[PDB]
Symmetry: D2
Subunit: 64 residues, 4 copies
């Protein structure tokens, strides 16, 4: 729901003034920061999932 | 190993981090769309 | 460098791969929930 | 919309038969395969985003 700011929203009026390219580059930094963040959550997820795996496997073998 | 309690905490944390990626991915997708129409407006300028 | 055409293709590919993560993340989240209630049923057995 | 199969859906009747743990471990393999897939798309996304970045920056400097 975090909607675009005017600095992020590329309008036709922005193009008639020649700032569409700079607004597109602004989006580039933000997008690429949000890939890094969502990548960092990936590594965290993969680490939290991996320890549930150890816990569940350690109990499966308690039955055995 | 880890307790049953710690196992539920990891469980609660995993669910919220999934919800967090969903929200980040919705934001990131909204911004990819803007670059989409910019490229299109510059492409559609290129044809005409 | 890359053409304007290749730039639009990367654009179209990025949007679909985002849509694909959304669908994978919805599947993965549904399965995390099942482990959630299993742990809870085993936890709620542990109290009683 | 890819809903759980009965092999994936852990019921109370599964617990009364002692197969909840194995179904939970089945979920573990699938979840962890889907983290790897969503991680692989991350790397692909980060690489496709990075080349739009080069293209947009190379045009910003053409104006200059
Ligand atoms: Mg604007
Ligand atoms: Mg079942």
């Amino acid at each position: 729901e975090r909607k675009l700011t005017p600095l992020e929203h590329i309008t036709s009026l922005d193009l008639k003034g020649g700032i569409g390219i700079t607004e597109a580059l602004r989006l580039q930094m933000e997008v690429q920061k949000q890939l890094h963040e969502q990548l960092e959550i990936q590594r965290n997820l993969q680490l939290r999932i991996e320890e549930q795996g150890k816990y569940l496997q350690m109990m499966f073998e308690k039955q055995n």
